[PDB]
Design a protein around this ligand. Structure first.
Ligand code: ATP
Lengths: 210, 338, 263
DNA sequence: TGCATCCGTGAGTG
DNA sequence: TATAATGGGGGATGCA
RNA sequence: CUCAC
């Protein structure tokens, strides 16, 4: 009934009353220290749906990643606005990033073994321990690592560098380590005797990175 | 200003679930259900009450009411007591609470993310007696029913299973609310069967069917009479304000002045007979004819008000009438009173 | 884990876990808070800065937020959000009309009546006319909001059986049914804990029902019976108009002891 | 400039 | 109760 | 739609 008695009683427009009554805009009864777009929420202010979800439930955004394409960032990492998340995906805000569904789970299995390695005396540097990437020995000339046992070869390579397991029956008799700079001369499932070269070391050899 | 468009816009805000997210939410819901099922075992309380409290804390403080079915009245005080009794559990017992909260919170998003289906389902049930938004607000209840019954282990997408409950909600709502005269669902189904049958008969004959053709095409137990009666009870009442239609309709209930007159002249010319008779004579007649209680008391019951048996009462009655019959033809008042 | 016992990824031995190729990346504007011992807050709770989160009160919150407990990563999240109270419908309006102290508004409006600029005096005058109307009457503004809706007696909107055994009813009956079918539906949707969209839509439809019962066709479109473009006769259409109760049944009736003939 | 509200009486027929 | 289905179909006057 | 103004 123009002019709206209720509307004129609360300094509310016809549009405003239409929005509040018929569920088009939220009207605030208690800000509780809230702030929208820089300004603190004042009572009797008209919030929309987005303005209400942002203030009441916070803001967030899920970005689709192409099937197969991995993410540049990792899980639990803080992100800035405009910061890249994937080779083609850019984030539109700041905050904590979360991996939705990791299609591939890679498990780095911890292994602790014991292996032997023969090297010329003047060619090896004496250390009680060896960090990854650190030079284990420097050979002035091509030296061939030779088998000290006889049996079948179990070859087990890594990302860089490799192992070697000599065994009779299925019981292991020898475990040799071939660092970065030691090229194997045998294959998997090969019969070797005592004395024959299993690998060649040339130049500087060091521990692998892993 | 348009509820339809407004609701369509409000529905286009919640994104569509990926298969992974779908299975995630469903799984979380089921896990929540089981978690509450064990929490009730731990606390030794009531599953419905517990899940209702979890719902309460999940939705916030905006929604707090006593739920029909729960024994305790859900006020913030009580839910505070219960929530404090939920925080009073060991780490391996208090860990099911988080699963309950997760279950409800995932249930909400699951319902919200599958609301666009109800629209596309109820879009074709239009013009049945209920409006678009009513069919939507019933199909939504059907969806709510579909959530608490879904089993993700069966590898079926939630759409396939929800569709059933949505249709089941709509087709019930229409059959329960569309008529001014509410008809039991099965009867409505019968009437619909009549409609489709008669429609087929009309389509093949080249003319409209009779009651007999319908009754024949319906099967055994069906005769023309039952078809006619079924069509009689299937009638939809019409409006009085139809261009009014209710202005050409008399008021049969209330007595007119002519009616009120004679009824007030019948009682008058009758208590002229409570006189000429006596006090007890003009009372055996009142019980017998039902002037006092409205019901006719036999000469059996009547005997227990004067002591007399069923044959002094009879002579008590016939003395009244026969005397009243002689009081007639001398006053001759009651003749026309027909 | 998986559907069946098979296909399950079981750790062969000791090692660490890494995740690659995510389906998507959920960027949340929140604050993380890891824990060692039992957590005191459950997920979904509202939290202010400096509230006892987990580990017996050691780790806490920095900002206003919503609690999101992660048991997989074993971390309590806080999504930056306030406990703001903003409502809708004729409930918030009822509250705002209840919060009114008409005396104070009379004071204020009287204090603004001294300002020039033409229009201010006028608006203050009208508003103060409404305020003083409520003050003198003794009526409360919140009564402009309906909790309990009155129901007209049956005979004044009768369902009667006509001459041919058919039934004829008033238009108020279908409106009342339209009201109840949404009120009860709302009462079911509330008890069963429905999402906000559904409840909002239901309340909106309820309002659409009371605004069709009292004055059909006033706002938006008039509700019609299926199969006709005829608006149902509301309680406003009954009283007002040339066909209204006033001009048709109070200021001029049909009478007994009256005949008509060609002169 | 948009919206809401008014726009003569009694009577007959289907 | 479980293929999957996910966004509709004139005519003038008073008053804000 | 018709009668009277
Ligand atoms: N009383 C009547 N008797 C016969 N035909 C009528 C009558 N009223 C209307 N009609 C028919 O309807 C046509 C015009 O009707 P119109 O729509 O102008 O009346 P209406 O709008 O129904 O009147 P109201 O709104 O007062 O009921 C007439 O030309 C005539 O054919």
């Amino acid at each position: 009934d123009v002019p709206s008695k209720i509307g004129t009683l609360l300094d509310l427009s016809a549009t405003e009353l239409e929005q509040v009554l018929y569920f088009s805009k939220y009207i605030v009864l208690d800000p509780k220290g809230a702030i929208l777009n820089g300004v603190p929420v004042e009572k009797r202010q008209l919030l929309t749906d987005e303005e209400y979800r942002e203030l009441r439930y916070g803001k967030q955004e899920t970005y689709p990643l192409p099937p197969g394409v991995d993410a540049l960032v990792k899980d639990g990492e803080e992100v800035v606005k405009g910061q890249e998340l994937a080779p083609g995906v850019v984030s539109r805000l700041d905050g904590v990033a979360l991996y939705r569904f990791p299609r591939r789970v890679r498990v780095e299995y911890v292994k602790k073994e014991r292996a032997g390695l023969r090297l010329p005396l003047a060619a090896w540097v004496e250390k009680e321990a060896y960090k990854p990437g650190e030079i284990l020995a420097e050979l002035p000339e091509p030296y061939l690592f030779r088998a000290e046992e006889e049996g079948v070869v179990e070859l087990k390579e890594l990302e860089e560098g490799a192992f070697l397991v000599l065994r009779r029956e299925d019981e292991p008799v020898a475990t040799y380590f071939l660092p970065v700079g030691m090229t194997p001369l045998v294959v998997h499932g090969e019969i070797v005797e005592k004395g024959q070269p299993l690998a060649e070391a040339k130049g500087l050899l060091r521990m692998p990175r892993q | 200003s348009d509820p339809v468009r407004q609701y369509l816009h409000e529905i286009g805000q919640v994104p569509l679930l990926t298969l992974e997210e779908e299975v995630e939410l469903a799984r979380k819901v089921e896990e929540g259900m089981e978690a509450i099922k064990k929490l009730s075992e731990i606390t030794g309380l009531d599953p419905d009450l517990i899940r209702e409290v979890v719902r309460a804390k999940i939705l916030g403080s905006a929604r707090v009411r006593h739920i029909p079915g729960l024994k305790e009245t859900l006020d913030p005080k009580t839910v505070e007591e219960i929530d404090q009794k939920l925080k009073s559990l060991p780490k391996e017992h208090k860990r099911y609470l988080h699963i309950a909260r997760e279950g409800e919170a995932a249930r909400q998003h699951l319902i919200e993310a599958n609301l666009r289906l109800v629209v596309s389902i109820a879009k074709k049930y239009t013009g049945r007696g209920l409006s678009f938004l009513d069919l939507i607000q019933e199909g939504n209840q059907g969806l709510i029913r579909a959530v608490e019954k879904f089993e993700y282990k069966r590898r079926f997408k939630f759409s396939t299973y929800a569709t059933w409950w949505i249709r089941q909600a709509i087709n019930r709502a229409i059959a329960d609310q569309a008529r001014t005269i509410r008809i039991p669902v099965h009867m409505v189904e019968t009437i619909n069967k009549l409609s489709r049958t008669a429609r087929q008969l009309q389509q093949e004959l080249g003319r409209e069917p009779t009651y007999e053709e319908i009754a024949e095409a319906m099967g055994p137990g069906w005769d023309a009479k039952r078809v006619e009666e079924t069509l009689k009870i299937a009638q939809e009442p019409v409006s009085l304000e139809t261009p009014f239609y209710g202005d050409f309709i008399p008021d049969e209930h209330l007595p007119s002045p002519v009616d009120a007159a004679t009824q007030s002249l019948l009682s008058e010319e009758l208590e002229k007979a409570l006189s000429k008779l006596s006090e007890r004579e003009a009372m055996v007649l009142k019980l017998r004819k039902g002037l006092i209680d409205g019901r006719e008391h036999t000469l059996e019951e009547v005997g227990a008000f004067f002591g007399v048996t069923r044959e002094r009462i009879r002579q008590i009655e016939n003395k009244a009438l026969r005397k009243l019959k002689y009081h007639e033809s001398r006053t001759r008042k009651l003749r026309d009173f027909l | 884990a998986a559907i069946d016992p098979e296909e399950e990824v079981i750790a062969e031995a000791e090692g660490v876990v890494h995740l690659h190729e995510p389906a998507s990346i959920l960027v949340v504007k929140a604050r993380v808070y890891p824990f060692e011992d039992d957590v005191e807050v459950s997920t979904g709770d509202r939290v202010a800065p400096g509230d006892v989160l987990a580990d017996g009160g050691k780790v806490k919150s920095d900002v206003y937020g919503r609690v999101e407990v992660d048991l997989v990563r074993n971390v309590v999240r806080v999504v930056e959000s306030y406990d703001i109270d903003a409502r809708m419908g004729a409930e918030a309006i009822q509250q705002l009309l209840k919060e009114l102290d008409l005396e104070a508004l009379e004071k204020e409006l009287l204090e603004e009546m001294k300002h020039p600029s033409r229009a201010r005096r006028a608006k203050a005058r009208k508003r103060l006319e409404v305020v003083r109307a409520f003050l003198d009457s003794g009526n409360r503004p919140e009564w402009m909001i309906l909790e309990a809706v009155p129901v007209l007696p049956p005979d004044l909107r009768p369902m009667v059986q006509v001459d041919g055994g058919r039934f004829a009813t008033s238009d108020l009956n279908d409106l009342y049914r339209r009201l109840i079918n949404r009120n009860n539906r709302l009462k079911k949707l509330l008890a069963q804990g429905a999402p906000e969209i559904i409840i909002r839509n239901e309340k909106r439809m309820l309002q659409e029902a009371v605004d069709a019962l009292l004055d059909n066709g006033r706002r938006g479109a008039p509700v019609t019976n299926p199969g006709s473009d005829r608006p149902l006769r509301s309680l406003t259409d009954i009283l007002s108009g040339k066909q209204g109760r006033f001009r048709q049944n109070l200021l001029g009736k049909r009478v007994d002891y009256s005949g008509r003939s060609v002169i």
